[PDB]
Scaffold this active site. Structure first.
Site, PDB file in Angstrom:
ATOM      1  CB  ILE A 167     -70.947  38.405 -33.125  1.00 32.37           C
ATOM      2  CG1 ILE A 167     -70.636  39.898 -33.099  1.00 32.37           C
ATOM      3  CG2 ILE A 167     -72.444  38.180 -32.898  1.00 32.37           C
ATOM      4  CD1 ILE A 167     -71.464  40.707 -34.066  1.00 32.37           C
ATOM      5  CB  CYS A 168     -71.225  33.453 -29.906  1.00 32.29           C
ATOM      6  SG  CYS A 168     -71.566  31.658 -29.890  1.00 32.29           S
ATOM      7  CG  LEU A 169     -75.916  35.349 -35.138  1.00 33.51           C
ATOM      8  CD1 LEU A 169     -77.053  34.886 -34.218  1.00 33.51           C
ATOM      9  CD2 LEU A 169     -76.066  36.833 -35.457  1.00 33.51           C
TER      10      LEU A 169
END
Length: 150
Positions: free
Chosen positions: A87-89
């Site tokens: 997840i790119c958060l």
């Protein structure tokens, strides 16, 4: 680990239980409190509607001074989530604060499903379709919810 992390993790779980997130689940897998599992049901008017998404959560030995490690175990068609389920958060790294909780993190991911960040793509092509042909994006997104999330 250590006393402080374990106490904060358990405090987080009590607050999460006493205020059940809307059709989102999260809690330890078994008896190790530093290992959690979360289930997210696709938003109602998103192409993910109807799907159930599972995630793995791993609290660092120094939590809340370090962010938890979160990843999707269920395949999903999305620009900010690759095939490894990564997840790119921002809040899961640089925008991480000890003042944040797993409950806030789940909410932040739910939002990600509803409103992706095509400018910070983890999957170039998905980011492209989204930006230039959102109706197709939704069709394919709906398709993967069928093959993988139901």
């Amino acid at each position: 680990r250590g006393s402080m992390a374990l106490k904060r993790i358990h405090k987080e779980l009590n607050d999460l239980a006493r205020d059940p997130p809307a059709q989102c689940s999260a809690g330890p897998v078994g008896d190790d409190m530093f290992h959690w599992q979360a289930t997210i049901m696709g938003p109602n008017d998103s192409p993910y509607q109807g799907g159930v998404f599972f995630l793995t959560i791993h609290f660092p030995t120094d939590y809340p001074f370090k962010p938890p490690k979160v990843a999707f175990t269920t395949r999903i068609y999305h620009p900010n989530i690759n095939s490894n389920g990564s997840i790119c958060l921002d809040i899961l790294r640089s925008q991480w604060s000890p003042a944040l909780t797993i409950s806030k993190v789940l909410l932040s991911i739910c939002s990600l499903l509803c409103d992706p960040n095509p400018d910070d793509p983890l999957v170039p092509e998905i980011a492209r379709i989204y930006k230039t042909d959102r109706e197709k994006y939704n069709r394919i997104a709906r398709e993967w919810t069928q093959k993988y999330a139901m």
